[PDB]
Amino acid sequence: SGFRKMAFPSGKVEGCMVQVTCGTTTLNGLWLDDVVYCPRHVICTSEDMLNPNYEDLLIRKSNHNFLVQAGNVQLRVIGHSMQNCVLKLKVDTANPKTPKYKFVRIQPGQTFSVLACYNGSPSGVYQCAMRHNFTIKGSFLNGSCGSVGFNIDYDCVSFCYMHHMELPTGVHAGTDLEGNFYGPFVDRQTAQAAGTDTTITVNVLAWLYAAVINGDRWFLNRFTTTLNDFNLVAMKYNYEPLTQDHVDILGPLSAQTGIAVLDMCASLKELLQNGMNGRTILGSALLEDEFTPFDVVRQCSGVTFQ
Amino acid sequence: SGFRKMAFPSGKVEGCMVQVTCGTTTLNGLWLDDVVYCPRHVICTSEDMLNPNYEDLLIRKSNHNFLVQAGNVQLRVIGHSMQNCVLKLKVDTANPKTPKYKFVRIQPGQTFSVLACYNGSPSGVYQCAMRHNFTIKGSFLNGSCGSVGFNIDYDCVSFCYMHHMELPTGVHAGTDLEGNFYGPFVDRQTAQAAGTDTTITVNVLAWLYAAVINGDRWFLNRFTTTLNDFNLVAMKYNYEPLTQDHVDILGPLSAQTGIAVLDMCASLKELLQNGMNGRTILGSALLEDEFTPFDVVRQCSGVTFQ
Numbered sequence: 072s073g074f075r076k077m078a079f080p081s082g083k084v085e086g087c088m089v090q091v092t093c094g095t096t097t098l099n100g101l102w103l104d105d106v107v108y109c110p111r112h113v114i115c116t117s118e119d120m121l122n123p124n125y126e127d128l129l130i131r132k133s134n135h136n137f138l139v140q141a142g143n144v145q146l147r148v149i150g151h152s153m154q155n156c157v158l159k160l161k162v163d164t165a166n167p168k169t170p171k172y173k174f175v176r177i178q179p180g181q182t183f184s185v186l187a188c189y190n191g192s193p194s195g196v197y198q199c200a201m202r203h204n205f206t207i208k209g210s211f212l213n214g215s216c217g218s219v220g221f222n223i224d225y226d227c228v229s230f231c232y233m234h235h236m237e238l239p240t241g242v243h244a245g246t247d248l249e250g251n252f253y254g255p256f257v258d259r260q261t262a263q264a265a266g267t268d269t270t271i272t273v274n275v276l277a278w279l280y281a282a283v284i285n286g287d288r289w290f291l292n293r294f295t296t297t298l299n300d301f302n303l304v305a306m307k308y309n310y311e312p313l314t315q316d317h318v319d320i321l322g323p324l325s326a327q328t329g330i331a332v333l334d335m336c337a338s339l340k341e342l343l344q345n346g347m348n349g350r351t352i353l354g355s356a357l358l359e360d361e362f363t364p365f366d367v368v369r370q371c372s373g374v375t376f377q
Numbered sequence: 378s379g380f381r382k383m384a385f386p387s388g389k390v391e392g393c394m395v396q397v398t399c400g401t402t403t404l405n406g407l408w409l410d411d412v413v414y415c416p417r418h419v420i421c422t423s424e425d426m427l428n429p430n431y432e433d434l435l436i437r438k439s440n441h442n443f444l445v446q447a448g449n450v451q452l453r454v455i456g457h458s459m460q461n462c463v464l465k466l467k468v469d470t471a472n473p474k475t476p477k478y479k480f481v482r483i484q485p486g487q488t489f490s491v492l493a494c495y496n497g498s499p500s501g502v503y504q505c506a507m508r509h510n511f512t513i514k515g516s517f518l519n520g521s522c523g524s525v526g527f528n529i530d531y532d533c534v535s536f537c538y539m540h541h542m543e544l545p546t547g548v549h550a551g552t553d554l555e556g557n558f559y560g561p562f563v564d565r566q567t568a569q570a571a572g573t574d575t576t577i578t579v580n581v582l583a584w585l586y587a588a589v590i591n592g593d594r595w596f597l598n599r600f601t602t603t604l605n606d607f608n609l610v611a612m613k614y615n616y617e618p619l620t621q622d623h624v625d626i627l628g629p630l631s632a633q634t635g636i637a638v639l640d641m642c643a644s645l646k647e648l649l650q651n652g653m654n655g656r657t658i659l660g661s662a663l664l665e666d667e668f669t670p671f672d673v674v675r676q677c678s679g680v681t682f683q
Contacts (some may be wrong), residue, residue, distance in 0.1 A: 072547045075516035077501035080492065082388025085683070142683070186386065192681035195383035196502060208660065210381035212679045241378045241592065286547065349652070354514065356662035373518045375498035377391070377448070 074281050074353045076361070077370055078184040079223045080377075081196040086168030089146070090191030091160070091217065092138040099188045099217030100139065100160070101230070101248070103169050107139055107146070107160040108248055109217045110235045111153055112258045120260040129153060140191060141166075155250030156258050157233065171227040174248040179203040180271040180311070182363050183220040183231050190214060200274070200361035201232075203311060204266040205254020206242040209234065219248075223376050238263050270310045271360040273317040276335055278359045280324035281367045282352050289350060291330070294337035301336045308343045320364050380587050380659045382667070383676055384490040385529045386683075387502040392474030395452070396497030397466070397523065398444040405494045405523030406445065406466070407536070407554070409475050413445055413452070413466040414554055415523045416541045417459055418564045426566040435459060446497060447472075461556030462564050463539065477533040480554040485509040486577040486617070488669050489526040489537050496520060506580070506667035507538075509617060510572040511560020512548040515540065525554075529682050544569050576616045577666040579623040582641055584665045586630035587673045588658050595656060597636070600643035607642045614649045626670050 091100040091109045094116065100109035112120065114128050132151070137160050139146040150161035177183065179201050187194040187210060199207045199220060211218065211234055220232030235258050236244040242265055244256035256263055283291070302312045318332045325332050342358060353359070368374075397406040397415045400422065406415035418426065420434050438457070443466050445452040456467035483489065485507050493500040493516060505513045505526060517524065517540055526538030541564050542550040548571055550562035562569055589597070608618045624638045631638050648664060659665070674680075 072518070072543060073514060073516040073549065075501075075503040075505075075514075076382060077493065077503045077516060078384060080387045080391050080499035080502055082386075082391040082499075085386050085388040187383065189679045189681050192683045193386035193388075194679060194681050195381075195676070196386055197381040197383045199381075208379060208381075210379040210383060210676060212378070212677075214679065237378060243379065346655070351663070357657070370501070370516060371518075373495045373500060373520065375495050375500050377498045 076198050078196040078198050081186045083170040084186050085193050088188050090140040102166040105165045111158045156246050157250035173229045175229040175231045176247040177231045185220045188218045203269045206265050209243040272310045272313050274360040275358045277364040277367045278362045283328050292338045292341050295334045296337040304340050382504050384502040384504050387492045389476040390492050391499050394494050396446040408472040411471045417464045462552050463556035479535045481535040481537045482553040483537045491526045494524045509575045512571050515549040578616045578619050580666040581664045583670040583673045584668045589634050593658050598644045598647050601640045602643040610646050
């Protein structure tokens, strides 16, 4: 028993992390087979970032201008190209620690683990979610760019996020591993405001199921509701509208606990309208929304990897 | 910027995790050099756990009764012995992935990362603290015994916890790697109640410093206090008494923010007496106490390992 915000084991990704330096800028890259992936703004100076022309800035770079270091060993760069907002540096040595892997572009509400790195060396690992405004709430200091987010399925690492930017409001933006930003953000130091950070309703409901499985039951109430009536309350509290697709995804947790999805919606409705009254759920004093249904099923059943 | 509950990279420990089976019981072991460490209750049946005589139960075991598996490969057990509540299984092969390591017995209030494993395979990694009642609030399902807790300093893994028991109240108990339980708990399925779970005051204060560094400042107030006056309020809210040793440990965070330790105590005092009024601090709706001062310094400066 117990329920914790739990990241994936990070060893498979630690073995892919390298340092990339261009000019005087140093950040992190991801070394998979004979390619190193990194943010293209490694080629920029601090001044360049206010209005960069990446195609023109890249004319002044050759293979030997990219210093790539795995631990204390230099990799030899034999080719480079820009793909959207990432650089692909071809190196002459396949990473011997390359795991089975996929590149995935995730949907808002989906969670992943971040391995925070500086200078090519791992710092820590934590769990995140893609918000509906296409930011993440990370922990990223200077030099963390190129740190990646990932999910693991048994033996296969699905890479879904590369870190690029901190917005002036302190939240974070980045790309998938094909170099396309999540949401409207750009790799330019400019006025970029995030939209509404709506609460991921289906994740809150999954977490309430996790609470019930663990014996936290005080919030279960006598009511049920409908999708349309619940959603009238969801909109008022800036929750994502619940769909029948979401109901279906909660099916297995509904079956395990015997609590119908709409009954749990009515308990959530009461929690939104009355608050928690100084009580806690699974040790939390707010409604947690960065556990997906699949996250809950995993932690409550003991799925392993390696 | 941003502040996250962040675990250590787990790769160094993943390479030490094995499966240990005795009779029909399977749990996890830790393989370091040519020794595998695991909970001694691997030798018990379900009935044995109500009143086990470990010395007598071990008479009926020989080396070949302990099946130790690293991935898909069997290790050869050439010796075994009981040390307090752990078994030390000598194997004929040193683990080639053994990191630099130490065994440490931690103090209440100290934090560590847990690599949850089942059947010798890592599931996830999360952060924990040794509570003042010598439990931890983990996430442990059946088969997770022998999962370990650890800290990393650059290249050295300090192992501090091995998981053994779930109390009937859902909290967790275990040993250091010399096999001595933290607190009064025993490896017997008996009535074991935990004492008061007091809040780790010095950690709350460290986290408030982390909040200030990140721009969460609404809770800073106009007051200061003294140790003795703050502690009169700490006792009423079941907070640990603050000592001058704690003040000294907060020195560097005090110097970085320019907020005197006793001034931050007076802000904490107001938070305890008035509550948070539906506001949040670093995304939390309660006062977080499982970040140590050293944890905060790390995450706010970018200390790395490998």
